Amino acid sequence: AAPANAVTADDPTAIALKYNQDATKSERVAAARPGLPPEEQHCANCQFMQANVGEGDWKGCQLFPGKLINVNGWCASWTLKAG
Ligand code: SF4
């Protein structure tokens, strides 16, 4: 079950960025974002994921203030975690 503050499918920014809480149900291949082959991309290896926010599989994303994403998710702003 998603937390009460999970990013949901009807969130305008989630629609615009094609977020899904399950990267296997995402369009990461189509987007071909740079940094890793697309099948390897998900929130856990994204620069915007905030490991000190949330709990368990539900963590922060800088782009979704006040919400939680799933570490196994993806959106089109995926960027390699470089630091
Ligand atoms: S920016 Fe990164 S951490 Fe945030 S939802 Fe998109 S892929 Fe996940």
* CATH code of the domain containing 2: 4.10.490.10
Residue 73: CB within 6 Å of ligand 1? yes
**Contacting residues for 24 by C-beta, under 8 A, at least 6 apart:** none
Buried b (16+ CB within 10 A) or exposed e, 44-68: bebebbeeebbeebbbbbebbeebb
**How many independent structural domains does the chain possess?**
1
3-state secondary structure of 46: strand
Residue 63: CB within 6 Å of ligand 1? yes
Residue 58: CB within 6 Å of ligand 1? no
From which experimental method does this structure derive? Answer: X-ray
Residue with tokens 């470089």: 82
Shortest-distance atom of ligand 1 to CA 75 = 6
Task: Answer yes or no: is 81 a known binding residue.
Answer: no
3-state secondary structure of 10: coil
The span from the CA of 58 to the CA of 71, in Å, is: 6
Task: Resolution in Å, one decimal, please.
Answer: 0.9
Sign of the C-alpha dihedral, residues 5, 65, 52, 16?
A: positive
Q: Please give the residue range of the domain that contains residue 68.
A: 1-83
20's tokens? 């899904």
**Contacting residues for 28 by C-beta, under 8 A, at least 6 apart:** 38, 39, 41, 74, 78
Paired residues of 80 in beta bridges = 46
Cβ atoms of 78 and 64 closer than 8 Å:
no
